[PDB]
Structures are given as C-alpha cells and as structure tokens.
Amino acid sequence: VTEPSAEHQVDIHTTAGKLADLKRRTEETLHPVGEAAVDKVHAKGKLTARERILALLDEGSFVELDALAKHRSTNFGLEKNRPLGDGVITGYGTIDGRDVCIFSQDATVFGGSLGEVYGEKIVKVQELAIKTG
Amino acid sequence: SKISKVLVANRGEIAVRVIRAAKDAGLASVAVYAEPDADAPHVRLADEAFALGGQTSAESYLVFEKILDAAEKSGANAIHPGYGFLSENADFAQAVIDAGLIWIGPSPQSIRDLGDKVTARHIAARAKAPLVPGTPDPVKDADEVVAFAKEHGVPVAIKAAFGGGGRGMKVARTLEEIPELFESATREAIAAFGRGECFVERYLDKPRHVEAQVIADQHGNVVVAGTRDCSLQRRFQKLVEEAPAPFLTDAQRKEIHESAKRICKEAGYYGAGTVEYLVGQDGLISFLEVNTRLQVEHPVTEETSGIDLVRQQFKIANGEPLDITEDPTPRGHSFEFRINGEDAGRGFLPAPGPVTKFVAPTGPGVRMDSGVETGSVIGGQFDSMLAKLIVTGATREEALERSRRALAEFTVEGLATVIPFHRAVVSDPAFIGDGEKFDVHTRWIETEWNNTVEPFTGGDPIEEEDTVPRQTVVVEVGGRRLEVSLPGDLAIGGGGGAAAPGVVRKKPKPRKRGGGGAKAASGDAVTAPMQGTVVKVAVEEGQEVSAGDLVVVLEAMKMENPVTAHKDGTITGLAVEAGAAITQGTVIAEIK
Amino acid sequence: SKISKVLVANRGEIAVRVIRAAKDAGLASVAVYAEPDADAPHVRLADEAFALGGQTSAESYLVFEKILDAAEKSGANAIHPGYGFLSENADFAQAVIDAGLIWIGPSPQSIRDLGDKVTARHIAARAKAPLVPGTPDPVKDADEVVAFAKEHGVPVAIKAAFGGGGRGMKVARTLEEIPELFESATREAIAAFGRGECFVERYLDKPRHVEAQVIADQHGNVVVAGTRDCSLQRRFQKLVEEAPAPFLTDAQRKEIHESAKRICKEAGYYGAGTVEYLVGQDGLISFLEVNTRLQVEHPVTEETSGIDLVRQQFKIANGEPLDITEDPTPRGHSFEFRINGEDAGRGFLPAPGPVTKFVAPTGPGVRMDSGVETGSVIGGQFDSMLAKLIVTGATREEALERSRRALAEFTVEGLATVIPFHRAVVSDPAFIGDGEKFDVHTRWIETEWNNTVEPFTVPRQTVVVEVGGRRLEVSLPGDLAI
Amino acid sequence: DHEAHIKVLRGEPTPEEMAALMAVLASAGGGPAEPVKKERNMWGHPVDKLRYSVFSWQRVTLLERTHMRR
Numbered sequence A: 001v002t003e004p005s006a007e008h009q010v011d012i013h014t015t016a017g018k019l020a021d022l023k024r025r026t027e028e029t030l031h032p033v034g035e036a037a038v039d040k041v042h043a044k045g046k047l048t049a050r051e052r053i054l055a056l057l058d059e060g061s062f063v064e065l066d067a068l069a070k071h072r073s074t075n076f077g078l079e080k081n082r083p084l085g086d087g088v089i090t091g092y093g094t095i096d097g098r099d100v101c102i103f104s105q106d107a108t109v110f111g112g113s114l115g116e117v118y119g120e121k122i123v124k125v126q127e128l129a130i131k132t133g
Numbered sequence B: 001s002k003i004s005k006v007l008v009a010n011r012g013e014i015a016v017r018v019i020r021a022a023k024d025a026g027l028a029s030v031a032v033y034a035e036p037d038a039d040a041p042h043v044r045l046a047d048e049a050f051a052l053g054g055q056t057s058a059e060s061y062l063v064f065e066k067i068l069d070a071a072e073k074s075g076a077n078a079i080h081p082g083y084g085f086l087s088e089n090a091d092f093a094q095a096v097i098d099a100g101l102i103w104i105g106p107s108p109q110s111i112r113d114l115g116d117k118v119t120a121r122h123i124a125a126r127a128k129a130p131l132v133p134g135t136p137d138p139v140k141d142a143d144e145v146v147a148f149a150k151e152h153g154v155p156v157a158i159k160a161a162f163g164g165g166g167r168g169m170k171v172a173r174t175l176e177e178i179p180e181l182f183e184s185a186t187r188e189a190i191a192a193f194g195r196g197e198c199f200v201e202r203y204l205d206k207p208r209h210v211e212a213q214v215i216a217d218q219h220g221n222v223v224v225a226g227t228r229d230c231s232l233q234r235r236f237q238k239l240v241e242e243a244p245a246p247f248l249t250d251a252q253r254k255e256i257h258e259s260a261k262r263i264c265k266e267a268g269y270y271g272a273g274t275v276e277y278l279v280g281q282d283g284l285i286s287f288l289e290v291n292t293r294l295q296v297e298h299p300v301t302e303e304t305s306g307i308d309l310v311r312q313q314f315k316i317a318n319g320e321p322l323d324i325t326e327d328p329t330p331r332g333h334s335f336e337f338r339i340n341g342e343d344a345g346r347g348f349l350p351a352p353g354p355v356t357k358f359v360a361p362t363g364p365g366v367r368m369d370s371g372v373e374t375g376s377v378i379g380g381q382f383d384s385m386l387a388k389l390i391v392t393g394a395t396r397e398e399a400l401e402r403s404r405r406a407l408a409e410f411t412v413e414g415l416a417t418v419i420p421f422h423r424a425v426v427s428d429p430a431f432i433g434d435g436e437k438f439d440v441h442t443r444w445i446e447t448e449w450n451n452t453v454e455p456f457t458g459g460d461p462i463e464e465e466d467t468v469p470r471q472t473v474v475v476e477v478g479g480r481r482l483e484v485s486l487p488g489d490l491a492i493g494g495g496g497g498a499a500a501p502g503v504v505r506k507k508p509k510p511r512k513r514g515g516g517g518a519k520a521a522s523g524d525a526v527t528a529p530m531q532g533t534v535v536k537v538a539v540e541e542g543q544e545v546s547a548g549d550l551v552v553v554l555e556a557m558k559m560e561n562p563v564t565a566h567k568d569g570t571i572t573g574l575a576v577e578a579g580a581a582i583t584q585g586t587v588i589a590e591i592k
Numbered sequence C: 001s002k003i004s005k006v007l008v009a010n011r012g013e014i015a016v017r018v019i020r021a022a023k024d025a026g027l028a029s030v031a032v033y034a035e036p037d038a039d040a041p042h043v044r045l046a047d048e049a050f051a052l053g054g055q056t057s058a059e060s061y062l063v064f065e066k067i068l069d070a071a072e073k074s075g076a077n078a079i080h081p082g083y084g085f086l087s088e089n090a091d092f093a094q095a096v097i098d099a100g101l102i103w104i105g106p107s108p109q110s111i112r113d114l115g116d117k118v119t120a121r122h123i124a125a126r127a128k129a130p131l132v133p134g135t136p137d138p139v140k141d142a143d144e145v146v147a148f149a150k151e152h153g154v155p156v157a158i159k160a161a162f163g164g165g166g167r168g169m170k171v172a173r174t175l176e177e178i179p180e181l182f183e184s185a186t187r188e189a190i191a192a193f194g195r196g197e198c199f200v201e202r203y204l205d206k207p208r209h210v211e212a213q214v215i216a217d218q219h220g221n222v223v224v225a226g227t228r229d230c231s232l233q234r235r236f237q238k239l240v241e242e243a244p245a246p247f248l249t250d251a252q253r254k255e256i257h258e259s260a261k262r263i264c265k266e267a268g269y270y271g272a273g274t275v276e277y278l279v280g281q282d283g284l285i286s287f288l289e290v291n292t293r294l295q296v297e298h299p300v301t302e303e304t305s306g307i308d309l310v311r312q313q314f315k316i317a318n319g320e321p322l323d324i325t326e327d328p329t330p331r332g333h334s335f336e337f338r339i340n341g342e343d344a345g346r347g348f349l350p351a352p353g354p355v356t357k358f359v360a361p362t363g364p365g366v367r368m369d370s371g372v373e374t375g376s377v378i379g380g381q382f383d384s385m386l387a388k389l390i391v392t393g394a395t396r397e398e399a400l401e402r403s404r405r406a407l408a409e410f411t412v413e414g415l416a417t418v419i420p421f422h423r424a425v426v427s428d429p430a431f432i433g434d435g436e437k438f439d440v441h442t443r444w445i446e447t448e449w450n451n452t453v454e455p456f457t458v459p460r461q462t463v464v465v466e467v468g469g470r471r472l473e474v475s476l477p478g479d480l481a482i
Numbered sequence D: 001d002h003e004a005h006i007k008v009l010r011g012e013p014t015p016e017e018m019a020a021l022m023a024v025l026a027s028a029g030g031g032p033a034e035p036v037k038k039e040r041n042m043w044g045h046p047v048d049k050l051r052y053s054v055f056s057w058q059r060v061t062l063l064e065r066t067h068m069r070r
C-alpha cells in the first residue's frame, strides 16, 4: 500500500523513522495545549514561558531538560489531560557569556499550578545550579 | 485518450522538469517519493505527492505495484517515467498500458527491440545505417572472437548483448587477451545483466560521441530536432555536452540526420528518443545505440532548437501529429554541465553529504535544472547528480565565455562536486579547439586531462594553523573594499594576550581509525566501510576465506564497492543478506 | 583606445548585468557602492569594489567627482553608466571623455540634442518620422495652449521640454482646464526639472507603447535589434514588457524599423538606444521619444534576437563596426516582469523592508536578473525594483504558460511586491489577446484592471593616514576587537 | 611556518594601501604585550571566609584545592 504525503509517517522500525518520531514530539512540546492558547497569550499581550526564556538568555544557548515530562496523577480525571513538560520549562543557558540555570512557569497548563512532575523539574534545575555554582 | 493528470515516476531534477512541463501544459502533476526524498523539491512542487516507502530504489521506485498503486490512488491517467529506473522497462510499460494509463513513451515492443543490442544491430543494418565492422550475431566462443580479430585487425571490443550504463564493454589489444577477456566478459554479463550473451566489433581509438535527437509521432512522422556532442565522459557516462555537434562536415551531419530518421522508421519508434553514433578520427560514423527514453541532455537541444521536448512527448502520447514538419535550424550554441556529487580530485568517486549551501548562477544565457537546494541531504542510495547547468550563447566562443562566468559564480558547499573540473575544462585548450577541430574524445578525461584538482576536504582543520579561530572583517583603504581575515591571537606590533595559561596548539588528528598497519589489531569483524545496500553476498557461514577474498558487494550512489576479507580464516556470524541496507561500521561477519 | 577595465557607475540589477558582460568579454570590472550598498551583490561580484560614501544618490552616485575619483583610483579606463543616474547626463559624459576615459554610450552632443524633446521633435520632423500634432516650440502662456486646443480638439497634453520619469505629463479635457493646468505645469517644470519650458500636443486616448531597439555604429551602420511592447504601465512607468511587439501589421513593423533608422541616422546617434513610439486605437504610429542609453527591457530583445546588447555597447565604444549586418529575425516570444517592491493592493505604493526570503524560479525558458538576495534590506533611498524575470517561449501562448508557472514558483517574503499583480495579469483575458489584438493600454492597469490583490501585511570608525604623497582613509567596523 | 597569518581574502591592494592598513591594524593592536607572570596572592581569598562543616567534603574539593592549585 502507498500513502498520501499527509498521512505518511516514516517506518518507526528504522533509525530515520525514530528520528522523525523525536522531531514530532519536540514540535509538540512547542504548544503543549494547542496553538489557540498561545494565540490567547499573545492577544493578551504577554510572552509565552518559552519566549521568556529565549528572550532572557543569549541566542542559541538554551538547553532544555525534561521537555517530554508528563504528569502521572489519576485524581479527578487528570489522567485525561497530560500536556508535555507538565507546565514548566527548565534548563540551562548563558547570559552575556556566563552560564545560568533557569526555569519558567507556564500559566496555560492547569493555570500554571504546581504538580508533582512540575516541582520535580524545578528541583532538578535547583540542584544543578547549587551543584555547578 | 488525452493526458489529464501525469504521475512522474521518478525523482530529482527530472521529476522537477516533468512537473514543470505538466504545469506549463495545464495538466495536474502527481509525484512519488521514497522515504529519503520526503523533502526533495519535486515532492513539494508537484500538485500531489505520494509516499512509496522503502529506503532504496529496489523497494521504492523499481516496484511496478507501488507506482501503479500511487497512480490508482491519485487518479492519474498518464505515467511519465523520466529517465533511468523504469524508463526502459518494457514490462513496466506493458503493465501501465494494461492498467489502462497513457504510457508517455515508446511502445513496449520498440523498447524490447531497441534494447536488445543484436536486434538493434539487425534493425540498423536493415535501415542501411552506417555501422562499424562487427559480428552480426553473438559470438559463441573466444575462438570465433580470435578469428574475427585476425580478420579485422586489433583492437576489438567485446560487448554484452544487453549491456548498458558503460559496464558492458571490454577491449582486446592483441589476439592473446581474447580468451580471458571473453570468459570474464561472459561471467560478468551473466551476473550484471542476467544474460551472458556478447558480440564483438572493431574498437575505435579516440572516437567522439555524437547523438541525434528524434521526435517521432504515432502517425509515422519523424523529425531530427538536432545533434549533440557528448565526448566528455568519466568512465563511459557523460559529464559535459554540446549542441549542435561542433566541427562536423555537412556530409556527416546529413548522414546522421538521415540515418536517424531511417532507423526510427524501421524500428517503428515513436515518442522522444535519441540515436547515438561514434565518429572516429577518420571521420567515419558508426551507429552505436538508440535510447528509447528522454535524454538527460535534452535541454541543450531545447535551447538551440527552441522546442519543448517534454511537451512534444506529451503530445505524442496524446496521439496528436507533430506540429513540426521540418528539422529546426539551430540558433546559437549550448553547453551542459552535470553537477555530480563527485570529487574530481579523487578519481570521480561519489560521496554523500549535505548541501549546506547552493547558489546557482543567473542572468544572460544561464539555465539551471536542479533537484536539490540548500538544506538538502544526499544519501547513498541514489545517483549523485545534483543539477544541470546549461549555458547558451550566439556562438561556441560566446557560449564558452558565458560558461566561464557561470561556473565562476556557481557555488556549492557541504560535499564535493565536479565544479572544479568544469571550470578547468571550459578553459582547457584541448576543448576550446583551433576553430576547426578539437582534441577531446571519450577517454580524454581519464587519460589525457591534466588533473590539477586537489581532494575535497570541506572546512575540516587539517594543519596546526587551521585550528586558530578567525574573524572576517570588511576594511576600506583609500576606497578599496578589502575582505580581511584576522586570527584570534594576532600578535601584530605590540599586541599580545595570545593563548592562555595552558593552551597548546597541535596538528589535529583525522577522524579516521589509524591506518593499514593496524587493519584489524586482533580484530575478526569485517565492517562496512560506507553506507549502502548489500547487493551481493559472496560467502556463507562456515566458509573458509583468505586475505583479499570477496565477502560482500555494497552499492552506494549506484556504484558497486567490494568488501573483502582482511585476514585468513573461517566466515562466522554472517549478519547480512542481499538487499539489506547497511550503515558505516556495521559488522558484516567475523573471520575466525 | 580599447576598453580594458570598466567601471560600472550604477547599482543593482544593471550593475550585475554589466559586470557579467565584462567578465564574459574578459574585461576587468569595478563596482562603486554607497553606504547602504556595502552588502549589495554587485559589490561582491565585481573584480574590484570602491566605496563612494554618502547615504543617498545625491551624495554617492550622482557626484561626478566621486565617480571619476573612483575610476582614477581603480585604474579603470572605461565607464558604463547603466541606466538612470548619469546615463543621460551630457555634462557627465563630457567629463568622462575629458578625463581620458572611454564613455560607453552615445556622444554628449547626441544626448543633449535628444534630451530636449523640442529638438527631438525637430530631428523627427527632419527624419520624416510619424508625429502627433503639437507645437514646434514651447508655448509662451496658457493662452497659446488654449488656442492650440481650439485648433485641434481636446483632449490635450502638456509636457516639460526637459526631464522625464513619466510624471511630466498633464492632461486637459476641456477648454476650462488649461489655465490652472498650465500654471501647475510651469511651476512643476521649474521646480523639479530645472527648466520651465513646456510644450503641448494631442493626447492619445488608449495608445500602445511600442519601442524599437537600435544598435547604432560609430561608422554610420544602424541595425534594429527588434521591436518591443510596454503598454502595461502605472504612473506612466512600465511593469510588464514583451518582445517582439505583438499584433502589429507588417506595414506597422515596417515604418517603425525604418523610422528608427532614419531618426538615429539624422541625429547622428551611435551606441545602443531605443526609439519609443505610440500606437493609437486607430492604428497610427507616432514618434514619442528616443532613449539614449541601454534600456531596462533589453533582456527580452536579447532573448528573442540572440544579440548581447551590453557586449555590443562595448564593441561600439571600442569603435569596431557592427558585426550584425541585417535586422535579426526573432526566434520566439519573451515577457519581462519587473519585481518592484510595491504593494499592488495599496495603489502600487513603495514599501521598504527586508528580503527575508527570495527564491527565484528556474527551469525551461526562465531568466532572472536580480540585484537582491535572501538577507538584503530595501530602503527608500533608491528605486524599488529588485529583479527582472524573463520568460521565453516558442510562441506567445507558450511564453504565457511558462510565465504562469514561473510566477507561481517565484517567492518573496518580508516586503510587498507586484508578484500578485503579475500573476493576475498573466491570466487576465485582456492581456491574453483573442489571437489578433489585446485590450491593454498605457492606462489599463489603473483604470480597467480589477485590482483584487489583498494588501500586504555600530557606526564605522575612520582613520586618516598619509603614505608618501597621498592621503588615505582607513574605515573599519566600530567593534573591531583585534 | 605553522602560524596563523593575516589574509586578504578579497581585493588586491597596492603597496601604499597595504602599508596604511598594516599601520592602522598594528596601532589598533594592543593589550598585554609581554606581561609578567601574574603574581599569586591568596591573602583573604573568598574560600577562606566560608563556614565549612567539620566533616565537609568541600574542605578537600574547594578549600584545599584552591590553596594548592598552582
């Protein structure tokens, strides 16, 4: 069988297919709750959490950690909604050539409220910063 | 029926060309792409795109069922095969016709007859074309070859009856080489093409390659759109072409034109096709082949004659009679250069890589038909061609001057190409000529050209000084614009601050594993030297082999590379099978 | 007495074209760039590049002293002005000749005579060229124009005897308009052309603008490279052009190929140039102008006739007789589209901005002459033309089909362009003639065309040095770290 | 001969422009030409002002390391 370009996904059982899968997931992390929420933020006149990090740090210096994290709660039907990153963007970078560790909370994910994986990511960057000085 | 939607069953610059022709004619276009081509220009250019799947041609473009399924799903009522792949597959043509789609090409019977060399020889003889002396029928033994050599004088060329791609011919200089050459030719033909039949003819010493472009309709009309000279060849495949054929007497020119028409009419040929001849140093013409596909060279004839050959081919497929009644008069002179992803300084050996930059020339007399753009990646599975640069002028001298300009402008980065060779040849006196003749021939590049091109190295730092960072600045000194590069540790005058408390500069080591002296330091594994496809496996597990014995044959860039045993021992743990794609460093087998 | 090194005293597309011509001919090329053009393609393409300074044309490209100093410093022995700027400035041509350089173009006398449209009309009369009725001398006052209107019949056209750009035209429809129109014409001619002389003639309603490219020798030989049509215009300036001129009768192609030769020979013209005519609905050809420089639309003539007009200019300046002995026969049809940085959805208004993406089409019958590339920034200091797309084919219909393809492929982002207008017009039936005539004219775009285009949405450091007997300026980036 | 040289990638200056350019560049160059070895002075180093737990591994990896780096 042949497929139209829209529906085709490279065979996941190949290295190229696995790279394509990683690209798809990375692209999804850009708008974890849909492009409508990003548009709402911009219309409100604010920057997204990612835009804030990219604006603060030097260009091309951001390395993100736990980008694909998801929450593991099952209470009150939370399991039906598991946005990537769980509402906080964490990583490290440079400001004026000097290394820093950074986190930025995302108000579009559960109102920006802190969950377990959220807090775990923040703890990870805090430990990294203390460790690296 | 009339073409309404064309499926281009090809890839690259030819796919782009046919898609553009369909757009010009107002027809819908459907492209089919393998997984490596998911982002090629043609996939985006075509009105529709379909994913054949598979990582190699044997499972992507050479599958009749996949191409026909794409046609069925897209609703395309015509199929155009480009060139290569299935363009000369009579079985595929008949399959398309049976499926009930307009096959944009010659009939399957014409394909068969003109693809069978001996049948082609019969057709040419019946058409009274100029032929070189040779055996009318396949030779049965080296004894017959020896008798023919005695009769007609050495050298003598032995050619496979179904050979193509330049691999199907070998030469004997003396009567003693005939037996070994015969047996090896038969053994290689049975393997490369299935059929081991071969025949023998006279070999020309320094021949030119001249071909005629023929546009023939289904109503019996045939028109010779022009002649081309393709005397510059790496091994037996063209690199640079001209239109019209330079320095040919009117007698030779009219002989070619008439022989081409006669051959096509005797073969019943229709659609765009080409007739290839050879012209020896004596001036004698010798019919060589009939290509039943659209030549890659066609743009030079398009420029000189002012005809759209792809659209003519659409019309012929539609069944309309030719709207051209006489051979067009050439205007100007056009050169064509193939931009192959090969390193001229390394014996023209193709290698894959990314096109990190691609800036084509533009302006007077320049046409560029490319299948890649900046950001494209050349894998190891398909042909090395990236684009074709056509430069047209009022005369041959004007075309050469414009070609020098255009090749100076043309820029590619990320992988090697043949631009340095084109730049050198367009100024070599042997190619310029004396105004009445020139010294180029089919073997000129590989045996007479003074190859001054150094191997491609990209931006890799090789020497100790290459490791120092640099900043490039624009400086105006008395108006003059200068582009000055400054090292990061320049101690000019009293300037200092060089290096750091413990910084040492040293010659970097190449990203290669040692050398031959440690080919396998207690290493039993046989590792693939390059990415490609295992097209042959010459051993089986438990087989004893000696150093130099062939283990596998990997096809990369449509060229075969043999991987041989590095040590004496028993083949153990054979890990690959024919048709398996292989990455560099993969363990093929362990010799123990 | 032979060109060895050519300085191109221009910018952009024409600079690139002339530099390429010099490279083809084997000549060395010297480009000159103003401050905004430090990154222009011609700067990097030329063998040598010189900075003229200045932020605008009045400071950089229009200064005789700067251009001639660049030539002297570079050692260039010839100067090619392209088009615009000083290409038609007789004073600059005379200065170039006096400096001992080869002026690639017509003589200062020819330029001066044919730039005065009154003297141009006199030469046309002497050459017996077709002429639209009009005053043979500048009109003294609005009363004379009123008398002429009464004599011949409105509408009427008023034009400054000097200058150009298309804006010099004023139109009067009734006898009451003349006073104010003439007063405005006199004021504008004084203010923007430096000379208040104005003249009057009959106004054609819906004419077709037709030209004939002429290659004129220094030895008297004259050859008409071919006709051309530029009827599609806005603000009296061209946007799309064709070659050969379509749908002219043989009797019309003749008398044009001959009026051009007669007018050029009478004026003593040598070098490349063009003779612009007008063809009214009635079918009457009328002499309009003579451009004494290489014209923008030369590519279509080059494609159809096979002549390289810039190299022909080099050969004429060298003084060699023309190698072309008879008028070439066109081998096909060619369209030329100007890629101007203008928003067609906003009344063709200039829009300065960055060229974030510029993907030129390529393939059969497509040629591109561009002065920009991805990353270029377009300001208001200069004309808004970015490139020229030439599409050639065996017939007019094939050329139109190829144009529809090439325009679909051509992509530009970051600023507005007339690409949408080109895409629309190439498919508009008025421009796809029925087979023997077509409906466009010098005002079709603004008046009939259905405009459906949606609107688009550190200082350098300098050091002064003296080496021997010269004073030099070394300019460096402000943040040179060294 | 393995040292990084200044390169004029584009342009063909004459001796006068070359001399002017080199003079200006040499003048622009500066900084520490042939500096003396930077004098060690550990007096009042920040590491000595920190509170270390009596069993802190930083007493080895930060305090001793800083005092001994040489």
Ligand SMILES: CCC(=O)SCCNC(=O)CCNC(=O)[C@H](O)C(C)(C)COP(=O)(O)OP(=O)(O)OC[C@H]1O[C@@H](n2cnc3c(N)ncnc32)[C@H](O)[C@@H]1OP(=O)(O)O
Residues within 6 Å of the ligand: A109, A110, A111, A112, A113
């Ligand atoms: C230490 C213990 C604590 O801190 S108890 C947590 C405090 N409770 C709060 O919600 C703080 C005050 N909250 C609010 O009233 C609003 O959410 C505030 C923060 C003012 C933001 O208002 P506004 O920007 O209009 O948003 P909204 O409330 O209309 O909708 C926000 C979406 O996110 C949700 N959300 C919000 N807060 C939480 C939370 N703490 N836990 C879980 N979900 C939360 C809202 O329900 C709403 O979700 P949805 O988009 O309607 O599906």
Ligand SMILES: Nc1ncnc2c1ncn2[C@@H]1O[C@H](COP(=O)(O)OP(=O)(O)OP(=O)(O)O)[C@@H](O)[C@H]1O
Residues within 6 Å of the ligand: B132, B157, B159, B163, B164, B165, B166, B167, B168, B169, B201, B202, B203, B204, B205, B207, B209, B233, B236, B278, B288, B289, B291, B442
């Ligand atoms: N008799 C001959 N003497 C010298 N060279 C020859 C002779 N026959 C063939 N050649 C060389 O072979 C080249 C092409 O050979 P041939 O036509 O048999 O194969 P091909 O072009 O690869 O085939 P195809 O296009 O059908 O796959 C010619 O250009 C010429 O270089």
Ligand SMILES: Nc1ncnc2c1ncn2[C@@H]1O[C@H](COP(=O)(O)OP(=O)(O)OP(=O)(O)O)[C@@H](O)[C@H]1O
Residues within 6 Å of the ligand: C132, C157, C163, C164, C165, C166, C167, C168, C169, C201, C202, C203, C204, C205, C207, C209, C233, C235, C236, C237, C276, C288, C289, C442
């Ligand atoms: N008599 C006329 N009737 C109608 N339109 C005219 C007439 N004379 C000139 N035009 C218009 O003027 C423009 C061309 O005039 P012309 O070239 O003489 O002017 P210009 O300002 O010097 O222009 P340029 O120097 O750019 O060619 C075209 O728009 C043409 O339609």
Ligand SMILES: *C(=O)CCCC[C@@H]1SC[C@@H]2NC(=O)N[C@@H]21
Residues within 6 Å of the ligand: B083, B084, B085, B237, B238, B296, B382, B383
């Ligand atoms: C396959 O990927 C493309 C076909 C490339 C080989 C064909 S063979 C015949 C033509 N001659 C040539 O050099 N390339 C074409």
Ligand SMILES: [Mg+2]
Residues within 6 Å of the ligand: B276, B289
């Ligand atoms: Mg061949």
Ligand SMILES: [Mg+2]
Residues within 6 Å of the ligand: C276, C289, C291
């Ligand atoms: Mg004009």
